[PDB]
């Protein structure tokens, strides 16, 4: 059943994106989507979501499209409930907008069901009692700052450091190790950046036209008005919630950028007539992030694991928009430009990184102890690097020289050739298992691979590939030495 289904109303007032609607038979509920049936002078349709009620017969709304050519007293009709978005495996491979209409010109979607955008966050009973590790198949992440099931994960990094490459690798590696799908919330993104993601995913075959796809794209770009850019984060989250709850699966979500959600709400909140809080943001800033980020969590049924980009405005970390977000996040991944330009990809600076589940209770004791020794050794190495610049390499102690040899190998072994980046690196990818990652790094700290050369560890995955490259280096070095032992 569905009451108030096609209940007719008329447009009372139009001030920008904010639009009032008069209903004869009482106003619908809050968050109720309304289609504007009147007129064919527009090129695109108009859909209004009720945010407030003014009286029993009038309700204030926000426009998802532009409000151009909208006359007063124009016919408006309800949908039945909230804005409804398609879900299931028929969505995979396709691009969508905030409403759930296909924006890729590849026919109608197969949708067997539609779910509402504004779902409620899970109760206490639905939460997982096992904080569990989400094995990304990447050495720097899994060892030092492991992503957890249900986790909000944060991707800190400047322009052109490896963000889009890491998201694409996680979409591959979720689907390799857990068989999971992925969803990409293009929240307030550049429309031109959306094309490059769609093409690069088509080239790497995470999205496939003819065959199997393992990605969903939901884009609410800068050109769109604030109502869309605000609600588009939730649209993607509804699709990921279907794969979590119904299909019972480990799923990734990718919100670039979560600041643009908060900023989009800051525009509507101004137009709604609400008094701004600190630094000109909406007074419901903490509540807006609350209802969004709480839905992103590991239930008993499945697990959504959202990696997010967060813009820090004016490089001011004390600003409300990041500062409020920091409480919600589990694994902070920091990408450095100097690390990228030195040759280490992915460009993860492990000292500035951190994870909540880096704890003897959650992960194993052998995982924590090995992971701490990598962080400890790299901290000693940075102190020793300042001494070698001043004094010299020969001036160091006997034990400290061996720490440098291991620490140099640790920095090189933290690099990894990505499977999506075969075109860039010119070498096949490497999914490194959690058991492989812990054992290989453990042996390096012991000093079992002291006689193994340094460049063997650079851009490989796991100890078998290290010893394979070291064999190739021994053979090629034997040949070139024999050439100079002659001329």
């Amino acid at each position: 059943v569905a009451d108030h289904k096609g209940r007719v109303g008329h447009v009372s007032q139009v001030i920008g994106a904010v639009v009032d609607v008069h209903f004869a038979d009482g106003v619908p509920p809050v968050l109720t989507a309304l289609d504007v049936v009147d007129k064919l002078g527009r090129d695109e349709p108009l859909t209004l979501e009720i945010v407030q009620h003014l009286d029993a017969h009038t309700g204030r709304c926000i426009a998802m499209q532009t409000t151009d050519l909208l006359k007063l007293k124009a016919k408006v009709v309800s949908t039945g409930g909230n804005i409804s978005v398609p879900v299931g495996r028929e969505t995979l491979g396709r691009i969508f907008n905030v409403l759930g209409d296909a924006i890729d010109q590849r026919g109608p979607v197969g949708e067997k069901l539609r779910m509402p955008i504004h779902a409620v966050a899970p109760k206490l009973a639905d939460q997982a009692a096992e904080d569990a590790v989400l094995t990304t198949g990447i050495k720097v992440i899994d060892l030092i700052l492991p992503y957890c099931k249900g986790g909000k994960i944060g991707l800190f990094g400047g322009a052109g450091v490896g963000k889009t490459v890491i998201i694409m690798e996680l979409i591959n590696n979720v689907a390799k190790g857990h068989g999971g799908f992925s969803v990409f919330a293009g929240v307030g993104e550049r429309t031109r950046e959306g094309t490059d993601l769609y093409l690069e995913m088509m080239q790497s075959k995470v999205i496939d036209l003819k065959g199997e796809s393992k990605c969903v794209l939901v884009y609410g770009q800068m050109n769109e008005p604030p109502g869309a850019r605000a609600r588009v984060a939730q649209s993607a989250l509804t699709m990921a919630e279907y794969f979590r709850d119904v299909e019972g699966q480990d799923v990734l979500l990718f919100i670039d950028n979560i600041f643009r959600f908060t900023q989009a709400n800051s525009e509507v909140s101004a137009l709604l007539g609400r008094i701004p809080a600190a630094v000109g943001y909406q007074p419901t800033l903490a509540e807006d992030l609350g209802q969004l980020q709480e839905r992103i969590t590991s239930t008993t049924k499945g697990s959504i694991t959202s990696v997010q980009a967060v813009y820090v405005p004016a490089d001011d970390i004390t600003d409300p928009a990041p500062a409020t977000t920091f409480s919600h996040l589990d694994a902070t991944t920091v990408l450095d430009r100097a690390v990228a330009e030195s040759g280490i990809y992915p460009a993860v600076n492990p000292l500035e990184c951190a994870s909540r589940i880096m704890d003897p209770d959650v992960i194993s004791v052998d995982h924590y102890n090995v992971a701490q020794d990598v962080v400890q050794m790299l901290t000693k190495y940075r102190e020793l690097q300042d001494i070698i610049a001043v004094l010299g390499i020969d001036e160091l102690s006997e034990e400290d020289k061996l720490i440098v040899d291991r620490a140099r190998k640790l920095v090189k072994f933290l690099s990894q050739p990505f499977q999506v980046a075969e075109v860039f690196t010119g070498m096949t990818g490497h999914y490194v298992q959690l058991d492989d990652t812990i054992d290989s790094f453990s042996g390096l700290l012991m000093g079992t691979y002291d006689q193994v050369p340094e460049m063997a560890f650079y851009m490989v995955g796991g100890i078998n590939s290290v010893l394979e490259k070291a064999k190739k280096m021994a053979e090629e070095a034997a040949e070139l030495e024999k050439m100079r032992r002659a001329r």
């Binding site: 106003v27 809050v30 009620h53 206490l124 639905d126 009692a129 809080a277 609350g290």
Partner: protein
């Protein structure tokens, strides 16, 4: 809730706030009372009255089923202030500010709006409250009825130190008379939902749910509940206080309560001031924390101890909400971010931290050792190539001892501190203090090897805890017997156990030494 009379219809909604038009007759609801809005024929939606306008209109703060509220719906009144379920039957359960129980995976009521105890109603704080931390219980000792703030940055251990304080009570509460049991009330204001679940499981595994009730207003739930959550927490504690029993109240955290109250105030066009907060944001936390107190002998001698948590942004105490709560509470426990990453956990900055009623709050035994520690750490911090005095040696060992994950038992703490005071860990190196302390508590070296011959004093006998609290360590009954235990433990540890460190210069043994010493940091 109990309906009475249909007072009006819903006119406007603006998220979590609404205004009503009165029904024919103009009955007029009472101020600060609950009202039930009929969202459907079967279901209701609660709300609190905040404004009674001249027009007849009534301002409402929405609480439940906010999505289901609509304009034109009927509104029933209670004609009563907000009362909630309180008592022993509410323990071991999760509950809203309104009183509804939350399901979790696998009782006479009390007014939330209540005045605090007056001048002659209270008394000086004498009963101690053990957090179970050597850093806190010596230097920043909390008394029963005291308000002790917890401040610091995100991920500095503000929740853990508050939750472990509740867990520390179970070992005492199980053994003692229930009259002196510390019943805990963890209020979770604006937190993530999974964080409440992990604390529920952590409280359940240590038997804390028996002596604890969890107030919960998560980030999904509205600002009206978050605003009211600490008030509902104290109400549940005041039951135990007014009926001559001692209680604990954790608010985690008042920063997010203030943000929820700011949302409410700003949405209702209340004039904002410093950092956009209303005029009465000080009054919000003041009337909350003053209801926590230590009552007189004339009114049972009960207590509500308060542990308000307040998040600071980049170690900035000059923020408006932080400075307000500092001026209300009886000192603070400051958690530094640099100490956290440096190693010290809990990261208690002793110089910044302070207890305004420390000396009178402490136990007679704990007062003996702790008075000296202030003198040693004062000289150690000032004096900190090398050159080691007796204070420099013994001072560094205290810093190693203060590191701990889970809370220490009063006997196991005070003996390991007494050892360091009289200088039993001087020959023992700084890295092997946790291995020395572990072998003192769980194992025992005198009974192991041979050279025991103590008549009563051992560490396996946990019941000596309460004899130590009565007589102290510096006393003719226990002094000679204790100094045997420590002399046997040091000589055997230095001879048999510390001899390995000169040995062990190989890869599978240095790593084995590390993994042993790492695990010793956790268990005290």
């Amino acid at each position: 809730f109990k309906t009475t009379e249909m007072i009006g219809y819903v006119h406007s909604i603006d998220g979590t706030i609404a205004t009503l038009i009165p029904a024919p007759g103009n009955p007029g609801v009472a101020y600060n009372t609950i009202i039930q809005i009929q969202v459907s024929p079967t279901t209701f939606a609660a709300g609190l009255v905040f404004n009674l306008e001249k027009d007849g209109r009534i301002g409402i703060i929405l609480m439940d089923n906010i999505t289901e509220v609509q304009s034109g719906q009927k509104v029933m009144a209670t004609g009563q202030l907000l009362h909630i379920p309180v008592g022993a039957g509410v323990l071991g359960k999760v509950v809203n500010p309104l009183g509804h129980e939350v399901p979790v995976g696998l009782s006479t009521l009390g007014k939330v709006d209540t005045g605090a105890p007056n001048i002659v109603s209270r008394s000086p704080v004498n009963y101690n409250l053990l957090t179970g931390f050597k850093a806190v219980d010596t230097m920043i000792p909390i008394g029963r009825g005291q308000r002790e703030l917890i401040v610091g940055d995100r991920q500095t251990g503000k929740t853990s130190i508050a939750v472990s304080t509740i867990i520390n009570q179970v070992r005492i509460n199980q053994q003692i008379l229930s009259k002196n049991a510390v019943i805990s009330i963890y209020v979770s204001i604006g937190q993530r939902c999974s964080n409440v679940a992990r604390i529920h499981r952590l409280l359940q595994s240590y038997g804390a749910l028996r002596y604890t009730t969890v107030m919960a207003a998560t980030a999904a739930e509205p600002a009206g509940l978050q605003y009211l959550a600490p008030y509902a927490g104290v109400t549940m504690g005041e039951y135990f206080m007014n009926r001559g029993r001692h209680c604990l109240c954790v608010y985690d955290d008042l920063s997010k309560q203030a943000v929820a109250y700011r949302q409410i105030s700003l949405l209702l066009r209340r004039p904002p001031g410093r950092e956009a907060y209303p005029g009465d944001v000080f009054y919000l936390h003041s009337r909350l924390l003053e209801r926590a107190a230590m009552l007189s002998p004339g009114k049972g001698g009960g207590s509500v101890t308060a542990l308000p948590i307040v998040e600071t942004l980049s170690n900035d105490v000059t923020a408006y909400i932080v400075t307000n709560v500092i001026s209300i509470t009886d000192g603070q426990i400051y958690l530094d971010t640099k100490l956290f990453t440096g190693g010290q956990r809990p990261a208690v900055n002793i110089g910044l931290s302070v207890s305004r009623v420390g000396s009178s709050a402490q136990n007679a035994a704990m007062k003996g050792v702790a008075g000296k520690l202030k003198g040693i750490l004062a000289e150690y911090r000032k004096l900190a190539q090398q050159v080691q005095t007796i204070p420099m040696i013994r001072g560094a060992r205290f810093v190693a001892l203060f590191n701990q994950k889970q809370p220490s038992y009063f006997m196991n703490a005070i003996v390991s501190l007494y050892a360091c005071l009289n200088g039993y860990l001087d020959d023992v190196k700084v890295q092997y203090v946790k291995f020395y302390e572990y072998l003192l508590v769980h194992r025992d070296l005198g009974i192991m090897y041979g050279t025991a011959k103590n008549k009563f004093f051992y560490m396996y006998v946990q019941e000596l805890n309460y004899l130590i609290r009565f007589f102290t360590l510096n006393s003719p009954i226990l002094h000679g017997e204790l100094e045997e235990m420590l002399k046997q433990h040091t000589h055997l540890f230095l001879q048999h156990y510390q001899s390995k460190m000169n040995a062990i210069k190989s890869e599978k043994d240095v790593k084995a030494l590390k993994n042993l010493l790492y695990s010793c940091k956790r268990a005290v």
